[PDB]
Design a protein around this motif. Structure first.
Motif, PDB file in Angstrom:
ATOM      1  N   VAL A   1      10.558  44.728  76.322  1.00 32.86           N
ATOM      2  CA  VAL A   1      10.179  43.660  75.399  1.00 32.86           C
ATOM      3  C   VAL A   1      11.177  43.544  74.250  1.00 32.86           C
ATOM      4  O   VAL A   1      11.673  42.449  73.952  1.00 32.86           O
ATOM      5  CB  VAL A   1       8.748  43.875  74.865  1.00 32.86           C
ATOM      6  CG1 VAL A   1       8.375  42.774  73.874  1.00 32.86           C
ATOM      7  CG2 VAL A   1       7.743  43.924  76.012  1.00 32.86           C
ATOM      8  N   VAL A   2      11.466  44.656  73.564  1.00 39.88           N
ATOM      9  CA  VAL A   2      12.201  44.580  72.302  1.00 39.88           C
ATOM     10  C   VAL A   2      13.663  44.989  72.417  1.00 39.88           C
ATOM     11  O   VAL A   2      14.428  44.762  71.465  1.00 39.88           O
ATOM     12  CB  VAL A   2      11.525  45.417  71.189  1.00 39.88           C
ATOM     13  CG1 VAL A   2      10.057  45.001  71.014  1.00 39.88           C
ATOM     14  CG2 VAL A   2      11.601  46.887  71.497  1.00 39.88           C
TER      15      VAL A   2
ATOM     16  N   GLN B   1      11.563  42.040  67.261  1.00 41.39           N
ATOM     17  CA  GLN B   1      12.530  41.152  66.621  1.00 41.39           C
ATOM     18  C   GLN B   1      12.003  39.750  66.348  1.00 41.39           C
ATOM     19  O   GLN B   1      12.650  38.996  65.607  1.00 41.39           O
ATOM     20  CB  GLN B   1      13.791  41.057  67.488  1.00 41.39           C
ATOM     21  CG  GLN B   1      14.429  42.403  67.754  1.00 41.39           C
ATOM     22  CD  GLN B   1      14.934  43.043  66.478  1.00 41.39           C
ATOM     23  OE1 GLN B   1      15.781  42.469  65.788  1.00 41.39           O
ATOM     24  NE2 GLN B   1      14.416  44.220  66.149  1.00 41.39           N
ATOM     25  N   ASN B   2      10.865  39.376  66.931  1.00 40.64           N
ATOM     26  CA  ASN B   2      10.263  38.074  66.690  1.00 40.64           C
ATOM     27  C   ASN B   2       8.791  38.171  67.066  1.00 40.64           C
ATOM     28  O   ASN B   2       8.335  39.192  67.594  1.00 40.64           O
ATOM     29  CB  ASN B   2      10.956  36.968  67.488  1.00 40.64           C
ATOM     30  CG  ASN B   2      11.035  37.297  68.960  1.00 40.64           C
ATOM     31  OD1 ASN B   2      10.010  37.541  69.602  1.00 40.64           O
ATOM     32  ND2 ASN B   2      12.254  37.316  69.511  1.00 40.64           N
TER      33      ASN B   2
ATOM     34  N   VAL C   1       6.205  40.800  69.094  1.00 42.63           N
ATOM     35  CA  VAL C   1       5.041  41.478  68.526  1.00 42.63           C
ATOM     36  C   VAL C   1       3.840  41.306  69.443  1.00 42.63           C
ATOM     37  O   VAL C   1       3.113  42.267  69.733  1.00 42.63           O
ATOM     38  CB  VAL C   1       4.717  40.952  67.120  1.00 42.63           C
ATOM     39  CG1 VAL C   1       3.493  41.679  66.593  1.00 42.63           C
ATOM     40  CG2 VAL C   1       5.891  41.190  66.170  1.00 42.63           C
ATOM     41  N   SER C   2       3.632  40.080  69.916  1.00 44.43           N
ATOM     42  CA  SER C   2       2.506  39.780  70.797  1.00 44.43           C
ATOM     43  C   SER C   2       2.585  40.592  72.085  1.00 44.43           C
ATOM     44  O   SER C   2       1.589  41.154  72.550  1.00 44.43           O
ATOM     45  CB  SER C   2       2.503  38.285  71.102  1.00 44.43           C
ATOM     46  OG  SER C   2       1.561  37.979  72.107  1.00 44.43           O
ATOM     47  N   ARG C   3       3.772  40.653  72.686  1.00 44.86           N
ATOM     48  CA  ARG C   3       3.920  41.357  73.953  1.00 44.86           C
ATOM     49  C   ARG C   3       3.821  42.870  73.780  1.00 44.86           C
ATOM     50  O   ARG C   3       3.297  43.561  74.663  1.00 44.86           O
ATOM     51  CB  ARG C   3       5.241  40.946  74.609  1.00 44.86           C
ATOM     52  CG  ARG C   3       5.242  39.488  75.086  1.00 44.86           C
ATOM     53  CD  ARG C   3       6.660  38.942  75.268  1.00 44.86           C
ATOM     54  NE  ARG C   3       7.406  39.740  76.236  1.00 44.86           N
ATOM     55  CZ  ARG C   3       8.732  39.794  76.295  1.00 44.86           C
ATOM     56  NH1 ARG C   3       9.458  39.092  75.432  1.00 44.86           N
ATOM     57  NH2 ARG C   3       9.327  40.552  77.209  1.00 44.86           N
ATOM     58  N   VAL C   4       4.286  43.415  72.649  1.00 47.30           N
ATOM     59  CA  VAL C   4       4.075  44.836  72.404  1.00 47.30           C
ATOM     60  C   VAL C   4       2.593  45.121  72.208  1.00 47.30           C
ATOM     61  O   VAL C   4       2.055  46.084  72.761  1.00 47.30           O
ATOM     62  CB  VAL C   4       4.900  45.319  71.197  1.00 47.30           C
ATOM     63  CG1 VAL C   4       4.496  46.744  70.799  1.00 47.30           C
ATOM     64  CG2 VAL C   4       6.378  45.260  71.521  1.00 47.30           C
ATOM     65  N   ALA C   5       1.909  44.292  71.415  1.00 48.39           N
ATOM     66  CA  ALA C   5       0.482  44.517  71.198  1.00 48.39           C
ATOM     67  C   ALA C   5      -0.292  44.452  72.514  1.00 48.39           C
ATOM     68  O   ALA C   5      -1.142  45.308  72.788  1.00 48.39           O
ATOM     69  CB  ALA C   5      -0.060  43.501  70.190  1.00 48.39           C
TER      70      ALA C   5
ATOM     71  N   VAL D   1      13.392  50.777  70.362  1.00 48.25           N
ATOM     72  CA  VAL D   1      12.327  51.706  70.726  1.00 48.25           C
ATOM     73  C   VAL D   1      12.848  53.115  70.501  1.00 48.25           C
ATOM     74  O   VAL D   1      13.944  53.450  70.964  1.00 48.25           O
ATOM     75  CB  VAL D   1      11.899  51.547  72.198  1.00 48.25           C
ATOM     76  CG1 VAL D   1      10.817  52.570  72.551  1.00 48.25           C
ATOM     77  CG2 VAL D   1      11.440  50.130  72.464  1.00 48.25           C
ATOM     78  N   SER D   2      12.074  53.945  69.813  1.00 45.90           N
ATOM     79  CA  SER D   2      12.478  55.334  69.631  1.00 45.90           C
ATOM     80  C   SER D   2      11.314  56.273  69.886  1.00 45.90           C
ATOM     81  O   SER D   2      10.225  56.092  69.331  1.00 45.90           O
ATOM     82  CB  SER D   2      13.028  55.584  68.231  1.00 45.90           C
ATOM     83  OG  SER D   2      13.684  56.835  68.192  1.00 45.90           O
ATOM     84  N   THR D   3      11.559  57.294  70.704  1.00 44.62           N
ATOM     85  CA  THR D   3      10.647  58.423  70.824  1.00 44.62           C
ATOM     86  C   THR D   3      11.224  59.695  70.202  1.00 44.62           C
ATOM     87  O   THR D   3      10.668  60.778  70.401  1.00 44.62           O
ATOM     88  CB  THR D   3      10.282  58.667  72.290  1.00 44.62           C
ATOM     89  OG1 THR D   3      11.457  59.049  73.025  1.00 44.62           O
ATOM     90  CG2 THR D   3       9.660  57.420  72.928  1.00 44.62           C
ATOM     91  N   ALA D   4      12.301  59.582  69.428  1.00 46.08           N
ATOM     92  CA  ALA D   4      12.910  60.746  68.801  1.00 46.08           C
ATOM     93  C   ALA D   4      12.002  61.348  67.729  1.00 46.08           C
ATOM     94  O   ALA D   4      11.408  60.629  66.919  1.00 46.08           O
ATOM     95  CB  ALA D   4      14.257  60.359  68.186  1.00 46.08           C
ATOM     96  N   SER D   5      11.934  62.683  67.703  1.00 44.38           N
ATOM     97  CA  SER D   5      11.039  63.389  66.786  1.00 44.38           C
ATOM     98  C   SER D   5      11.260  62.976  65.332  1.00 44.38           C
ATOM     99  O   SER D   5      10.302  62.680  64.606  1.00 44.38           O
ATOM    100  CB  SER D   5      11.224  64.903  66.939  1.00 44.38           C
ATOM    101  OG  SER D   5      10.845  65.342  68.229  1.00 44.38           O
ATOM    102  N   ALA D   6      12.512  63.001  64.866  1.00 47.67           N
ATOM    103  CA  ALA D   6      12.749  62.725  63.451  1.00 47.67           C
ATOM    104  C   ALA D   6      12.366  61.295  63.096  1.00 47.67           C
ATOM    105  O   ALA D   6      11.851  61.048  62.001  1.00 47.67           O
ATOM    106  CB  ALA D   6      14.209  62.979  63.077  1.00 47.67           C
TER     107      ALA D   6
END
Ligand SMILES: Cc1cc2nc3c(=O)[nH]c(=O)nc-3n(C[C@H](O)[C@H](O)[C@H](O)COP(=O)(O)OP(=O)(O)OC[C@H]3O[C@@H](n4cnc5c(N)ncnc54)[C@H](O)[C@@H]3O)c2cc1C
Ligand SMILES: CC[C@H](C)C(=O)C(=O)O
Ligand SMILES: [Mn+2]
Length: 454
Positions: free
Chosen positions: A12-13, A47-48, A52-56, A18-23
């Motif tokens: 999507v983005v 980014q738009n 947001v809609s598609r992530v939700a 997208v980050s799965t990094a611990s810090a």
């Protein structure tokens, strides 16, 4: 959080967003409160609004919690990922649009701060007045129901939010007052805008806010006034309000707060102090000043110490009071109270709060928007489990004293993780069930910032 799910988010983005990094997750697992960091399982930057809609929709249908994230300056743990999930950092959507100076309105995306907006409005003769101390996202301010020093004259976020664009939990796009609409008043249907102001990310994701703009004041004078006691400063405040002086700003600092601010920025006399500001024409200002100085004098106030750059210095120190307090004990964190009471009861509770801070081992400074009947006790905490329990018990007792006086447990900061029990006491069983029924129809699966408010 599965690998298939992460790749779906990246689809999507975009991989960079997208980050799965611990810090990175740790940095998005806390705000400015003492609430313990609870890292989300991933952080995503849409980014738009389509993203947001598609992530939700992706999170919601997969049973993954969603935590909206603005600038992370909240003070009740709103962004803490108590159930894990996906933190949606909204700040790459940072455009100002639909500036309608003739109508006194503007539309802002979540990455726009009040600073950025007022910079953009320089030379327009207009400004946006709601001024939290922090450089906060304006959509985040709509989400928390924020106010500030200017609210006594120019209103809170609730007064100045005219429309909201909201991505609902399952991805649908809602314009609370209708797409593109802006107006001074309406009776059309149920007012949906007010429901989402102060919803703290538990009812949906605010992706734009339509804001009321105000004309810049003709002339401005600021001053400080030192008092012999807390009682004298707060009585002056109540009497200024009952005399209907249209003060632009009336901020209280106790002697502890004043000293902390002196040390962190000023060389004001160490005393309970009002920071004052007046807006108007030259003659309107002289009338306001005369009537206000008379009231302060009656209560032992000093002659006003007057304050361009000096005024900016004064209000910058006020806006940094949170950090000035923390600096009294480096390494500590802090919890702010935020009660708001009927103004006639403000003298009792503030004086009582001052007395209670003295009688305890806690370090506390007092500051805030006494023109609204509102104030903050900033309580320092060593991250000393016994001290943190004494701070939390002090906060709850102050909250319940405010409720006993007919007031509210939070004037502007919100509930987050800290005031959920106080809210139940404040509105009672039918109030709680009604709020929860509203939450359930908008977020059936309970995935929209779980664990907050209710
Ligand atoms: C030094 C300092 C001074 C402050 N002074 C004030 C003050 O005078 N008045 C005041 O009211 N507050 C004040 N605050 C608190 C804070 O700045 C406000 O509550 C502000 O509105 C939070 O905005 P944010 O984007 O930083 O919030 P965040 O911490 O990012 O989020 C706060 C909550 O709102 C939700 N949220 C954030 N953005 C959105 C969105 N776009 N859509 C939906 N939900 C969202 C989050 O999920 C969370 O529950 C102060 C904070 C600091 C550190
Ligand atoms: C972060 C809390 C702070 C004390 C505040 O709200 C203010 O500066 O008015
Ligand atoms: Mn405040």
């Amino acid at each position: 959080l599965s690998q298939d799910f992460v790749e779906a988010l990246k689809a999507v983005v975009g991989s960079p967003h997208v980050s799965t990094a611990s810090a990175v997750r740790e940095q998005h697992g806390h705000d400015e409160s003492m609430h313990r960091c609870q890292p989300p399982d991933a952080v995503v930057w849409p980014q738009n609004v389509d993203q947001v809609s598609r992530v939700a929709s992706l999170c919601y249908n997969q049973g993954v919690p969603i935590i909206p994230f603005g600038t992370g300056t909240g003070v009740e743990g709103g962004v803490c990922a108590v159930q894990g999930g996906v933190c949606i950092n909204l700040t790459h959507m940072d455009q100002i649009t639909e500036l309608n100076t003739e109508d006194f309105s503007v539309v802002v995306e979540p990455g726009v701060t009040r600073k950025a907006l007022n910079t953009h409005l320089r030379d327009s003769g207009l400004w946006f007045p709601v001024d939290p101390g922090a450089d906060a996202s304006l959509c985040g301010m709509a989400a928390t129901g924020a106010s500030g020093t200017n609210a006594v004259r120019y209103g809170t976020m609730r007064d100045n939010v005219i429309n909201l664009e909201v991505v609902l939990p399952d991805g649908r796009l809602l314009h609370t007052a209708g797409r593109g609409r802006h107006y001074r008043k309406s009776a059309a249907g149920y007012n949906l805008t007010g429901l989402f102001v102060g919803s703290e990310g538990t009812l949906g994701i605010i992706t734009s806010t339509t804001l009321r703009l105000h004309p810049a004041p003709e002339a401005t004078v600021a001053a400080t006034c030192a008092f012999p006691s807390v009682q004298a400063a707060v009585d002056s405040t109540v009497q200024i309000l009952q005399a209907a002086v249209p003060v632009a700003r009336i901020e209280f600092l106790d002697d502890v707060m004043m000293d902390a601010c002196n040390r962190h920025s000023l060389n004001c006399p160490v005393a309970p102090t009002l920071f004052l500001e007046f807006h108007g024409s030259q003659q309107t200002l002289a009338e306001q000043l005369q009537r206000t100085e008379a009231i302060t004098q009656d209560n032992g106030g000093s002659h006003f110490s007057w304050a361009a750059e000096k005024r900016n210095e004064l209000w910058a120190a006020r806006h940094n009071a949170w950090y000035a307090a923390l600096a009294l004990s480096p390494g500590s964190k802090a919890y702010s109270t935020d009660v708001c009471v009927p103004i006639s009861r403000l003298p009792e509770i503030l004086v009582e709060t001052k007395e209670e801070i003295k009688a305890s081992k806690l370090t506390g400074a007092i500051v805030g928007h006494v023109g609204d009947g509102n104030f903050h006790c900033i309580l320092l905490v060593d991250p000393d489990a016994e001290e943190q329990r004494r701070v939390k018990a002090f906060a709850e007792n102050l909250g319940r004293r405010a409720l006993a006086l007919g007031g509210t447990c939070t004037g502007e900061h919100g509930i987050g993780l800290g005031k959920r029990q106080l809210l139940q006491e404040e509105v009672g069983p039918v109030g709680v069930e009604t709020m929860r029924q509203l939450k359930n129809t908008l977020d059936p699966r309970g995935l929209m910032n779980p664990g907050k408010v209710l």
